[PDB]
Design a binder for this molecule. Sequence first.
Ligand SMILES: O=c1ccn([C@H]2C[C@H](O)[C@@H](COP(=O)(O)O)O2)c(=O)[nH]1
Ligand SMILES: O=c1ccn([C@H]2C[C@H](O)[C@@H](COP(=O)(O)O)O2)c(=O)[nH]1
Ligand SMILES: O=c1ccn([C@H]2C[C@H](O)[C@@H](COP(=O)(O)O)O2)c(=O)[nH]1
Lengths: 140, 140, 140
Amino acid sequence: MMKKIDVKILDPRVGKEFPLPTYATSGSAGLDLRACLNDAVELAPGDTTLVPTGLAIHIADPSLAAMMLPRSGLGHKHGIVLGNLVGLIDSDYQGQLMISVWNRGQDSFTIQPGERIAQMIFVPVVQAEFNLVEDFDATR
Amino acid sequence: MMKKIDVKILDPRVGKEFPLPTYATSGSAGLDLRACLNDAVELAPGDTTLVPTGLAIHIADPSLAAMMLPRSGLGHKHGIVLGNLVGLIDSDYQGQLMISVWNRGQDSFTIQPGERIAQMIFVPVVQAEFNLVEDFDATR
Amino acid sequence: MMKKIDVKILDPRVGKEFPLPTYATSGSAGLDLRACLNDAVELAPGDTTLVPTGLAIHIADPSLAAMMLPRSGLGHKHGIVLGNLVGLIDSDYQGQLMISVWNRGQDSFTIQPGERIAQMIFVPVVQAEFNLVEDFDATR
Ligand SMILES: O=c1ccn([C@H]2C[C@H](O)[C@@H](COP(=O)(O)O)O2)c(=O)[nH]1
Ligand SMILES: O=c1ccn([C@H]2C[C@H](O)[C@@H](COP(=O)(O)O)O2)c(=O)[nH]1
Ligand SMILES: O=c1ccn([C@H]2C[C@H](O)[C@@H](COP(=O)(O)O)O2)c(=O)[nH]1
């Protein structure tokens, strides 16, 4: 499935100095999100900092959501992940996408302006309606 | 996609003192899960505790799963996340939903009865059948 | 949805000494991935190690991805999770699946050859095309 998603550029560097998120290849699942910062931010081991992206999206379709994930190299090699682990973006959220960057490792890390700091996937989601029962059907 | 899901209330406070999970808005991707506790649990930095929800679900449809995620504010601001990071709920699981709460930060945290401690999304899943090959087709 | 996925066995122990990933039940969302190692690896608290699986997959379909997640018991009980938290596998990735194993807890852990160290789910993904707008439609 392909989907057009409205995006608002909140910082005029986004799409210029800080490239807009793109899929690296036709078979890529995620887009990389970049740090929209004026200056580098040093992130000490154990600390968390909130990094703006300079953009907002409006998924709009309640059958879709986005999930923000760490980048594999940053996470594995540098211990730079998300403070909320996975960031869930609701279809009706229209605010700036913000990235909770957490240093889970032992080495201080410099977050540079424009650095790819997270990735984002769009996944279908199902809205559950709970049906209260006394007993389930037989299943395991 | 909308789906009705059977749920069993295991603790009679759930749906009363501890509200049943709901979608906050029509465009929300996730439902918040609450701590079904008799008394507050203090969670020291670095520690993990298993928190009951007082409910069980039976997704039943093998094309669907649920994923439990940290809440964004708890994770980012308080360092309160999941000890298994993401909790995968199988379609044929009928046990109580349990939340592994892990304090990944530096500040002790009081988990209160009724506190929203995680969120849960329902996502379609695909069951893979592996086809063993010597070589892949050309792709990157 | 069911999907056949091409897999290449890179280490001849995979499918023999190290069982190929399987769904435990018909309603299971994920498959367990095993450590393809010659000898046990001791993982001290706070440390990360890259563990091979001895296999490669080629999802091929750009409407599908895989996500690697911690196992619930390892994560909750032993503090053994993923260093990148969640591992996203692109449809056009044809390399060996590698698992970033991170000890987020306080107890040293022995990763044994053949140990189930992660699980993997296949989820539909949507490739977003951004549509730049000045203002969103009314939504929350
Ligand atoms: O890592 C994150 C997680 C969430 N959000 C945005 C998208 C969500 O729809 C919105 C509301 O989050 P909650 O307050 O409901 O958790 O915050 C982010 O920008 N980054
Ligand atoms: O955070 C979690 C993760 C899993 N489970 C339940 C749902 C799963 O289907 C079931 C089996 O998990 P495993 O033992 O297969 O990991 O445990 C939870 O209640 N909470
Ligand atoms: O935990 C992980 C995460 C990723 N990959 C593989 C699959 C991805 O498609 C590929 C490229 O990852 P990036 O360099 O784009 O993050 O690495 C793994 O083997 N394990």
